Every structure is written in structure tokens, then in C-alpha cells.
Amino acid sequence: KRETSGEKSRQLINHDTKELEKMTNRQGMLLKKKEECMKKIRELGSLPQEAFEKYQTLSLKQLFRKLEQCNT
């Protein structure tokens, strides 16, 4: 997206370019919050078992229900 935004700004008037730059800055801040994510698992130090690969669900919605019920 940043690549495409830069391309569009380079071909071009100014208001669309600064909107593209500000939304890439929001992308950068989203990158910033997606930087702590592989450390936050690291300080957990979680203990994995043999049943890791069988729980293969990419829904991410019933997964939250599973975490809620396990907490309960």
C-alpha cells in the first residue's frame, strides 16, 4: 500500500499526496503496534505440548470463545 501511495504521489494535487502520506504514517503506527507482538509472546514463556498442530482453526472467533471458556 505504501508503494502504491508513493507511486500515486510521484505521478501527481497536493492534498491527495498529503492524504496518502498521512495514511502511510498511520500504516507505520500500525507497524509500530505490530512490532510488540512477537515480544509479547516471548515474555509469556508459554509451554507447548504435543497437541499443538491438531487445534488447526483460522476462524479467530471461536478461538476467542475457547479462550473465554478456558478462563471461566
Added chain:
Amino acid sequence: MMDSSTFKRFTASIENILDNLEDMLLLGKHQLNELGSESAKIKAMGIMDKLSTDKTVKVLNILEKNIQDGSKLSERLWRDLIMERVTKSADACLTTINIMTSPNMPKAVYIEDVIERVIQYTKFHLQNTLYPQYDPVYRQRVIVMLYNKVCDIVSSLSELLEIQLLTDTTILQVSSMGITPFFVENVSELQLCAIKLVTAVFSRYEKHRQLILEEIFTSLARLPTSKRSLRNFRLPMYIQMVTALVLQLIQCVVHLPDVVITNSYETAMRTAQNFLSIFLKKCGSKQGEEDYRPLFENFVQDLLSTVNKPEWPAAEL
């Protein structure tokens, strides 16, 4: 060296020929012995940029190996016996080296089952073999080399436990072994390694202070009480071991990140005062059939014997 891929490919060839010939049930002594010998330092920087699922399958394979003598319950069959324990002890060495090897270690390249397995292997085989013939109260170079492997594996266990959090269902028994050998005779370097382990478990977790002090006070009567080699910690001026154990518990808890310093430090004096209060009240009265007084006198002369050295503080406290 940024890669030094000049024996990285040597080891990588070793595991790929191994898992080819085994996966498509034992791998023998000599190969795994040299594998651990090279694993000492060659992969200690080069373990990075290696295939993860191969690591999972090899730790599963050596897990299934250590299953065989896990709680093994054991003139010519004794040769098979000794070679079985030496083979699985080398396997234990490969486990405890392989897990710790990288300075930054990616999650779930390990499962706690194998660490549990090496722990129970350590428990049973140590209490079965090494204590009775190094302490006759509980009652050729193979025992010595097994001993050295035990020392190395428990040291690596200590630094591995400092590296990452473990579950309490591991913490209880690893603390049990960390305190266990402190009442037999010829185990001094094991006792240093046990000091390292109790540093790891004690500074890493704040929830087992009560636990540790209770198993401390339980078996104090098992002390050797011998004039020979009672003080074996250099600072002449050799000192008794469990005194320095107490000292390093005292200085071990800091929890360095504001007022966290103050509350943690007063927590340290509170933990110390609970320790010494309970120890004193157990000592003071004369219990049936035994006493805790001579423990208290030798303990305190060692305490004021190490009163003023810049790497042993808090004796003044």
C-alpha cells in the same frame, strides 16, 4: 564470525543423515557422544538459520530414546546396564545443550515433556547410583564421567531455566533437586551447580519463598557433621556450603527493573527475617532425640567469618 558455515554444514549433514536413516530404535553411543562434543561450541553460535521442524522431530526422537531409561528401575548384564545409563546420559546432555544453544531461542522448538523426562531421569538415576557409593549412610571411571555429565547437565538446566519461564509442576521438583544434595559428602561442585539452579528458580519466581524455606528446615538433621571436608568453599579460609547457600538466597532477590527498589529490598529483609525467625525458633528448644544447636553455632561463625568481603554483603544485616 557472521556465519562461519564451515562446520555448520558438518553438523547439519549429521542430523540430516540421522533423521533420514531413522525416520524413513537406538542410535548408539559413539555418534551421539561426538555429536554432543561438537555441540558444545560449534553450534553455540551456529544453531541459528536451521530448519525448525527438523529440530522438533529430532527432539521427539531423542525423547523416545530417553523414554526407555526414564525411571529405568535398575556380572555381565551390568555392562549392558552401565552402557544404557551412559548412552541416555549423553542423550540428556544433547537435550540440555540443544535447547539452550541459541542466545535468542524461538518459542516451541521444545516441549516440556522432554525436560520433564530428563528431570525424572536425573531424579531416579542420581538417587539410585551416585549417593549410595559416595555416602555410605544411604548405603570404574564410568561413575566419574557420569558424575561430570550430571554436573554439566544441571548447570545447563540452571541457565536454561533462567532463560525462560517454566510451569510450577516443574518448579516444585527442580527446587527439590536443587536442595537435595546438600546433605551428602563428596558433592561440592554439584552444590555450586545447585546454587546456580536455586538462583535461577528463586530470583525468577517470587511465589515459592515459603516452599524453599520449608524444605530447608525439614531435613537439617541430615547434615554430615564431620570434621573432614566440612568447609570447602574458597573465599585458606574455606567455608561450609549451606551457609553460602543462605547468603546467596539473601543477596539473590533484587528484581531490578522507582519505589520498586525500596519495596523489593524491604521484601528481602522480610524474607530473611522470616527465615531466621523460623530457623531460630526451631533451633531454640531441645527436641526429642536430636538438636539443632550445633547447626546454629557453626552457621553463625561462618556468617561472621564472611562478615566483610565486598562480594558477600548483608551479613551485617
